[PDB]
Nucleic acid binder design. Structure first.
Lengths: 52, 132, 132, 132, 132, 132, 132, 132
RNA sequence: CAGCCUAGGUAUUGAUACCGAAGCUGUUGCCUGGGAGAAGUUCCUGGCAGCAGAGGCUGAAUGUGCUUUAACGAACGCUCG
C-alpha cells in the first residue's frame, strides 16, 4: 500500500508536468523538504522533476 | 549547466592514451553535471561528475566537488558482456571562503595540477609508498 | 466554356463505366467551376473542379487547375451514416506563357491524355509501379 | 513499369501529330524516371517526367507525379543559338491512400483522360475560357 | 534477371495453394526489384524483394538478397478496413566471392531449396521445434 | 526435428548431384544443430547449421536461422592437402510472433522454396544479373 | 539505346578477333548500363559500362562516360582456377552543353573513332611510343 | 609515335566530311603532342592532344591520354571576329600495366573503336539516349 | 550575418495550414546490438554524428565587438542631361 501511495504521488507530479506549470508542480516538492522552501529564479518543468 | 565535450589526453604512465567525455545531463538539485565516455557499457564508460554549491544556511563557504569513476572493464567474462571488477574512485573536494578570489582559486587549481603532473604524487598514488 | 452535364464514357479498367457530372456552378471568390455526379448522398459524390486563373501582374503566368476527387465510404456496423473512409485526389496544373498559343496548348493536352492512356502511366498508377 | 520508347499518336487539334519519347532513365536522387523527344538540340526536346513516391510515415499517403515540359525557342537575329523563349508545363499529381485499389485508381485515370478529352477542358485551356 | 509475373504453385502445408506476384518498380534508392500479390489491396500487403549488390569496398564478395514478407490482417466485427494483426517475413542471403563459379552458385541455390523441402526444416519452422 | 542423416537428392545446375550431410551434433552453448557431408578434412566439407531462438524478453519474437557453407577445394599439384580458396555462404532467418500460425509459417517456407527455383532468382544468383 | 547483344567485329592488332558482349543490366544507383562477355567467373570477363549523365543544376552539361576493362587470366597449371593478373583500363568521357547539337556530337564521335584508327595513336598505345 | 599530317576521313553523321590535322609543338612542361585543323584560324580552335605518361612512384602503370577539343563559334550579325559560343570535348585515358602486352593494348584499342562505331554508343552519344 | 521568397517538402474532406532544412542519395568516422558459420573470417541485422548532391532575391563587414558611431540645411567633388 505504501508503494501504491508513492506511485500515486509520482503520478500527481507527472500529471502536473504534463498539464504544464512551474509553481503548482511543487505540490510534492513541499512533501519532502519538511520546510518552507523558497524559490531563487525561474526554473523549468523537467528540471524541477528530473531530480527535484 | 555544463554541456561541453572534453577531449582529454596524456592518459596513463605512457601518456599515449586519450579519452573523450561527452555530457550526459545535469542534476537540478545540487548543481551537478555529468560526463561520460562514448560507448554503451558502464565499465567501458568513465564517469566524471562535477558539482558546484553556493552558501545557503548550513555552511558559509563554497564547495567544488569532483567524482571520477574509472571502472576496469574486463573483456572475457563468459559472454560478450564486459563487466566491472575494480571500481576506480577519485573524489576531490574544495572549500573556498566567500571572500576569496579567482586568483586564489586559480592558484590552488594550478598547484594541484602541477603536483599531480610531477613525480611527487605519482609514487604515492601508483606505487603506494610513504614519505621516507 | 458553358457549363453543362458532361458524360464521360469508356472509363475504368475495362473502359465500360460512365460518369454523368452535373455542374455545381462557380465559386464567386475562388472563381472556379465545379461539377459533381448525381447521387443520393452529397458527401459520396465524385466531384470535379476546374479553374482558369487570369494573368497576374508583370508575370501573367497563364494558369489552369483541375482537381478531381473521388470518395468511398463504408458504413460501419451500428452507424447510420456512410462516413467517407477513403478519398482519391488528382490535380492537374497547366502553365502557359502570355504568348503561348492554342497550338502547343492543345498539343500539351493531347500529350497528357495520350500518356495517361499509355502503358507507362497505366502500370505506374494502377499498380503503383515505379518506372525504371 | 519498364521504360521503353513511348509512342503517342493522334494528338493536336486535328489529332494527327505523333510524339516518340525515348527513355532518359531515372534520377538516383529523386527516384524519378524521365523521357524525352528525340531531336537535335537537347534544350529543345519535349520532356516528360514520371514519379511515384513510396509510403510516408504514419499517414503513408501514396503519391504519383507526372511533369510534362514542352519548350520552344526562337532564333533571334544575330544569335547563333535557338534560345528557349517559351515553355509549356503540365503537372499532374495523384494521391492515393494505402487502402486504395487498382479499380478506383484506373477509374481515376480514365476519368481524368476523358475529362481532358471532353469539350470542357477543350474550351477551358485550348482557348483559356474560364468555365461558367 | 528480367522482371515479370511469377506464379508459384504447390505452396503451404499441404502444397496446394498458389501465389502470383506481379512486378513492381525497381527501387532507384538502392537498386532492388520488387514483386507483389496479384492484388488489388494485397499488392501493397505481400512483398518479395530481390537485390544483387556488386563488389565494392564493403562488398567483395557479391551479395544477393531476397526478402519475403506476408502481413496477416483482420477486420474487427464492425470495422471496414483490414488492419494488420501479424507480420511474417524471411530473409535469404548468398555472399559469393569474385572468383566464384556459377555452377557452385546454383549448387548452393539447389541445396538451400532441398533443405527447405527437407522434413528437418519444415519441422523446426512450421512447428518451431529445436532439433532434439 | 531430431537430427539424422539428411540426403538432398537432385541439386545443382543440371540437377544431377546429391548431398549426404551426416549428423554431427548440437552445440548446446548456443542451441545449434549441425550437419556435415562425409569426409575427413574439417576445412573441406559442405556444412549446414540450424538454430531455433525463442522469444527472449528483449526480443519477444520467434527466430529460425539456417546456414549453409560450401568451401572450394583448389587442390594443388602436390605439396600438401588442398587449400580453402573460396567459401560460398547462404543464410536464411525466418521470424514470427508468439501467436504465429503453423499454416502461414509453412506458407512462407514454401513461398521461399519455390522462389529459389523460379527463373528470377535463377539468373539473379546464377548469373549475378541485377533484377531488371 | 535499348540494351542488346553487342557483336563487335574484327579487332586486335591484325583485326581478326570478334567480341560478343551480352547485356547484363543497368545499375540505377548511378544509371549505368553494363555489358559483359559471356563467361562464368565474374572475375574473368571483359566488360563495358555506359552512363549518360544529364545536366545537373551543379554542372549543367551533358556527360557520356564509356568505361572498358579487360582482364588477363594467366591460368596456372592446376591447383585452382585462373587468377586476375593484368587489368587493362580504358575510359572515354564525352562532354557537351545543353544547346549542343547532334551533328557536333556525332562529329566528335567519328573523330575519336578515326584517330583511334590513325597511325599516331596506333604507335602511342600499341608501342607506348611518346608522341614525337 | 611520329608527328605529321593525319587525314581523318568519313566523319560525322553521314560519314562524309574529312579533317586534316597538322602537327604542333610538344609541350615540354608536360610532354604532350598536339594536332590542329589545317588552318588558318581553326588551328587556334580545333585541337587533338596526345600524351604518354611513363611509370613513376605514382604511375606504374603507364597512362596514355588523348584529348579532343572542338569549339563551335559564330559571328554576330554586325561583328567581325567569330566568338566561341560552344565547346565540345572528350578525353580517352588508357591505364596500362608495366607487363602489359601490345597485343592486349591493340585489342583494347580496337574494342573502343568499334564500340564507338556501334549502335549503342552512336545513340548514347549523338542522341544522348541512356541505355534503356 | 540578417532578412525575403520559392521551385520543393509537407499535410490536408477539396479549400486551406507549417517549413525552406525539407527529402532522399551516397560517403567519413563513432558504431553497438541482436544471431552465428566457426572464423587463420564470412554471413544475417542495427543506430549516432559529420561531409558532398534545392534554389535564388535584398541589405551589413571589409581584421573583430559595441555603448556618445546621430539629425538638420549649404558648399565641394561627382553622375546626368
Amino acid at each position: 500500500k505504501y508503494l501504491g501511495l508513492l506511485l500515486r504521488r509520482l503520478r500527481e507530479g507527472y500529471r502536473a508536468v504534463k498539464r504544464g506549470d512551474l509553481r503548482a508542480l511543487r505540490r510534492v516538492i513541499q512533501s519532502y523538504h519538511n520546510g518552507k522552501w523558497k524559490p531563487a529564479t525561474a526554473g523549468n518543468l523537467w528540471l524541477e522533476f528530473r531530480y527535484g | 549547466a555544463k554541456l561541453e565535450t572534453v577531449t582529454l589526453g596524456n592518459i596513463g604512465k605512457d601518456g599515449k592514451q586519450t579519452l573523450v567525455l561527452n555530457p550526459r545531463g545535469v542534476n537540478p538539485t545540487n548543481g551537478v553535471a555529468s560526463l561520460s565516455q562514448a560507448g554503451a557499457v558502464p565499465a567501458l564508460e568513465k564517469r566524471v561528475t562535477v558539482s558546484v554549491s553556493q552558501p545557503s544556511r548550513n555552511r558559509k563557504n563554497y564547495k567544488v566537488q569532483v567524482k571520477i569513476q574509472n571502472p576496469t572493464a574486463c573483456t572475457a567474462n563468459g559472454s560478450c558482456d564486459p563487466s566491472v571488477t575494480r571500481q576506480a574512485y577519485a573524489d576531490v573536494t574544495f572549500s573556498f571562503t566567500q571572500y576569496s578570489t579567482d586568483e586564489e582559486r586559480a592558484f590552488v587549481r594550478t598547484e594541484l595540477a602541477a603536483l599531480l603532473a610531477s613525480p611527487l604524487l605519482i609514487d604515492a598514488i601508483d606505487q603506494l609508498n610513504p614519505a621516507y
